[PDB]
Write a protein that binds this ligand. Sequence first.
Ligand SMILES: NC(=O)c1ccc[n+]([C@@H]2O[C@H](COP(=O)([O-])OP(=O)(O)OC[C@H]3O[C@@H](n4cnc5c(N)ncnc54)[C@H](O)[C@@H]3O)[C@@H](O)[C@H]2O)c1
Ligand SMILES: NC(=O)c1ccc[n+]([C@@H]2O[C@H](COP(=O)([O-])OP(=O)(O)OC[C@H]3O[C@@H](n4cnc5c(N)ncnc54)[C@H](O)[C@@H]3O)[C@@H](O)[C@H]2O)c1
Ligand SMILES: [Zn+2]
Ligand SMILES: [Zn+2]
Ligand SMILES: [Zn+2]
Ligand SMILES: [Zn+2]
Lengths: 373, 376
Amino acid sequence: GKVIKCKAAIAWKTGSPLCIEEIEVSPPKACEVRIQVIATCVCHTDINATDPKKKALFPVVLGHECAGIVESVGPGVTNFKPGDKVIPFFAPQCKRCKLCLSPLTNLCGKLRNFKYPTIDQELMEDRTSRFTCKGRSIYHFMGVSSFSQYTVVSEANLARVDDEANLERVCLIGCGFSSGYGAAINTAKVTPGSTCAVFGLGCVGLSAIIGCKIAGASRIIAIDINGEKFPKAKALGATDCLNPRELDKPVQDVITELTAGGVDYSLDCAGTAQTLKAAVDCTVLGWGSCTVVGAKVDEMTIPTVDVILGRSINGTFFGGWKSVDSVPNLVSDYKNKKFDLDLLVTHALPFESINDAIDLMKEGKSIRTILTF
Amino acid sequence: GTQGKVIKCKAAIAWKTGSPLCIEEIEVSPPKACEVRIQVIATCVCHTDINATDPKKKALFPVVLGHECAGIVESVGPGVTNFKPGDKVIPFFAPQCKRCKLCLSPLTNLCGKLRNFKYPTIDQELMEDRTSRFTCKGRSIYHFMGVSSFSQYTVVSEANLARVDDEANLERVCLIGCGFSSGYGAAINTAKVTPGSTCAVFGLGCVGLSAIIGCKIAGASRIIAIDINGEKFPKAKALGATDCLNPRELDKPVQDVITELTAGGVDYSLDCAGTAQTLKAAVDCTVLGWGSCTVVGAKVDEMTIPTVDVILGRSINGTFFGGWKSVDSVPNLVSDYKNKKFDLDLLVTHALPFESINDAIDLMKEGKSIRTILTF
Ligand SMILES: NC(=O)c1ccc[n+]([C@@H]2O[C@H](COP(=O)([O-])OP(=O)(O)OC[C@H]3O[C@@H](n4cnc5c(N)ncnc54)[C@H](O)[C@@H]3O)[C@@H](O)[C@H]2O)c1
Ligand SMILES: NC(=O)c1ccc[n+]([C@@H]2O[C@H](COP(=O)([O-])OP(=O)(O)OC[C@H]3O[C@@H](n4cnc5c(N)ncnc54)[C@H](O)[C@@H]3O)[C@@H](O)[C@H]2O)c1
Ligand SMILES: [Zn+2]
Ligand SMILES: [Zn+2]
Ligand SMILES: [Zn+2]
Ligand SMILES: [Zn+2]
């Protein structure tokens, strides 16, 4: 149980980017595992914390998508040992609450702020922190904090995985891939031979397409305002591609015409007012289904008639997966080549170059950027 | 009443919005191909009808309103064999052609007969050949929702009616024409209330109460009834409500009352009022993870749903005629009523002569009635 000194990325406040600092990562207490981050990625959620218009706590060690090894475990911990390949996640499964036992949801009672899940799991189970830098205790982020060479997480926020897993790719299963993928399969519940529509072709949206294909969809329409996204969209299974920017008609009307009624399943992995409205509009009447995955705005307005006429609306949380039991399976699949994560990794960079990773992200020049140490 | 001949009878015409209904003598043309002329025996005023007289609402005039009724076939048109003079029938706004994609899908109860998907209320304003069967004072009167039951005799499409048990009490079974079927089906079909679950219903009118009946039948273990009219609580409870709430007498939003009361929220919520308040509340009051909200009523065009709610498990949908496959379901509902599966009798508060329709409308407006049977 020795204290560890390593580099991590600290956000001391909004507006101000992340700083590479030297922090002290305390050892894991009971029911906790101290992880060694091998590969982490910057996700849209990470960058929001620094946005003033968005709620967040500081100072904080951001990041939540990664994969690694077990550095050391805490007391009573027997499910983990030094060397085990593990993947942490923001979606807990403590297996000690009513929600964990329910087959109707993948939510867990460990959670507490159901209005701002982004500022939850800001501290360990004992309301304490394991991060210290220059005499100050730093907040954890969404129960993961992957932007540090070493981090400590609740046994409820990680799963051991295949020993032969390539941490440089399997890490996406920590958030990006799992949400898009699971959103199509568990939340939207895409059915064989169906027609789907996916707005937003980032990591989530692409995994949603991968998800639609795996579920057996016969048609998959990918929509983005960034044409540069299309090539890879098709690579993963898209049958059609639309750019609102190049259409003299609201993209939803185009989709409705191209399908003679609209699509059976809609998945919004963008989250804008425009996309949210379209995601619903483009669905057929009677059984049309829209599933919210991404959300850049807090509210969505829905016509009372649309709903009276068959269209339903739901949303996903971590792809609807029961984290601790599913993550390991998703890994086995990638291994068995059920799908290919590599197409999702467009860049790789030294951890210290995390800000440039953020810049490529914002610039929309990438899907996911693997950060190594 | 003789076939192939125009009929002179009385109806209730709405010459324009903001105006009451006028008892006029109209001419009801005989049925054309795939049509049936019905002698309306019993009819009721639904909120949807009154809604048409609202100046702020998009509607067409002149028109014979009414869509909730029951009656006897006075005659059929060319090439009609499923119906014949004497048959008891119940028409409805929800068509079932049986010969279209939508009709074949077990996922919806809509048929491709419907044309206007943004303003249903002003759809089926005329017959298939784009004309009218109604003439009054040298003028063409608009039909309403493919029924127009506010006339002793009316002409409807074969896809808009079902033949029911010859021994059906048409002065009760007429509620299956809309009100009952809607709330009842909403809980059973659209919301899909399951055994042991907890439900919340907003709006304790005919629909709202039928929604309660349906929750009881589906096996709910708790049915919370919400309404700003405490007078509606006795019947609501009589039909199955285990708890009753009035937002006008609470310090906290009703949805927070319901959340606490249920330690998390209800499994299924049905909004049979349809206001900006009820809609928001209907979604809020549900449990996260698997909470389900079903829109039944709607006095407003839109509802604002928080992104996080949906992400965190709550989902939304709505019903159209309770989600019953019209022609196939309606006769079944009648049999169920005969087998005393439920009591429509409790949904009837008044019974006036057709001439008093304007009073029946006021009673509804003034929330002093559930349903008022109108007879000719
Ligand atoms: N519900 C969950 O559990 C969950 C899990 C992970 C990520 N997310 C969220 O999902 C979203 C997507 O994640 P990402 O990593 O792919 O982000 P990203 O920024 O890379 O993806 C957004 C994509 O949508 C496109 N876009 C923007 N406006 C558009 C418009 N009007 N029409 C069409 N396309 C448009 C962009 O060009 C881009 O390709 C984020 O908002 C993220 O926070 C949600
Ligand atoms: N979706 C469909 O297919 C369908 C079919 C038929 C009728 N409807 C609609 O369903 C609704 C109900 O029909 P009805 O015949 O029972 O109408 P109604 O006028 O008799 O019922 C209104 C009821 O809601 C209550 N109410 C009003 N504001 C409220 C509030 N803020 N909170 C709680 N309760 C409130 C009233 O006090 C009253 O008891 C109407 O809007 C009607 O047009 C929909
Ligand atoms: Zn993420
Ligand atoms: Zn749990
Ligand atoms: Zn009605
Ligand atoms: Zn049909």
